[PDB]
Write a protein that binds this ligand. Structure first.
Ligand SMILES: NC(=O)C1=CN2[C@@H]3O[C@H](COP(=O)(O)OP(=O)(O)OC[C@H]4O[C@@H](n5cnc6c(N)ncnc65)[C@H](OP(=O)(O)O)[C@@H]4O)[C@@H](O)[C@H]3O[C@@H]2CC1
Ligand SMILES: CCc1nc(N)nc(N)c1C#CCc1cc(-c2ccc(C(=O)O)cc2)ccc1OC
Length: 157
């Protein structure tokens, strides 16, 4: 199974200056639940912004740098290498990789952040004419999660 895994705001912002524009612990847990024991694929910039590989899953970084070699990280140099990865593979970021993969993936796990943030990186446009809503779950607000958000599982028609 090949999935997209992304959080974007009302205008499809996913990032600002190498970081996430919002602080939302429930979504990180959502990411952890979904991807633990599976595979995350990410472009080089996304990985460097994270800093280190995420625990308890395969971390695959796509780059053209043939010197790239980080411990805990597997490296691929072609989009085409993605299709060779076994198991449940999540396309994790960033804008460049989302643009390359959105027409190829089976489904998308989107967290819609219900706000308008300043961004410099965006999720590509997509229409619900192409995607069935398998589920839509409102996130709970609290002490530490103060921005409305909705977990979507979209499946290609
Ligand atoms: N929530 C997110 O997903 C976030 C992502 N990070 C943002 O990516 C922002 C803008 O740059 P972007 O091009 O979107 O970076 P992504 O694709 O991770 O990674 C780009 C790199 O992936 C690699 N790449 C993507 N496609 C290919 C490819 N087809 N072949 C070889 N390398 C690939 C190539 O890396 P390289 O310069 O070291 O060779 C490319 O420049 C960049 O500002 C990062 O900050 C955000 C923080 C939030
Ligand atoms: C975690 C935000 C997020 N949510 C969803 N639904 N899909 C995604 N693809 C990303 C993402 C991302 C990139 C990113 C992840 C993280 C991150 C940090 C910690 C954990 C964790 O503790 O599980 C997960 C992701 C941190 C920074 C960062 O870019 C700056």
């Amino acid at each position: 199974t090949l999935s997209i895994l992304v959080a974007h705001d009302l205008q499809r912002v996913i990032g600002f200056e190498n970081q996430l524009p919002w602080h939302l612990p429930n979504d990180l847990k959502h990411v952890k639940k979904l991807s633990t024991g599976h595979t995350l694929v990410m472009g080089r910039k996304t990985f460097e912004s994270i800093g280190k590989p995420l625990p308890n899953r395969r971390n695959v970084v796509l780059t053209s740098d043939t010197s790239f070699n980080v411990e805990g990280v597997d490296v691929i140099h072609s989009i085409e290498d993605i299709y060779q990865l076994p198991g449940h593979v999540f396309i994790f970021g960033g804008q460049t990789l989302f643009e390359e993969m959105i027409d190829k993936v089976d489904d998308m796990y989107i967290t819609v952040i219900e706000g308008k943030f300043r961004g410099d990186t965006f999720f590509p446009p997509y229409t619900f004419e192409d995607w069935e809503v398998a589920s839509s779950v409102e996130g709970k607000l609290d002490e530490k999660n103060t921005i409305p958000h909705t977990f979507l599982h979209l499946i290609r028609k």
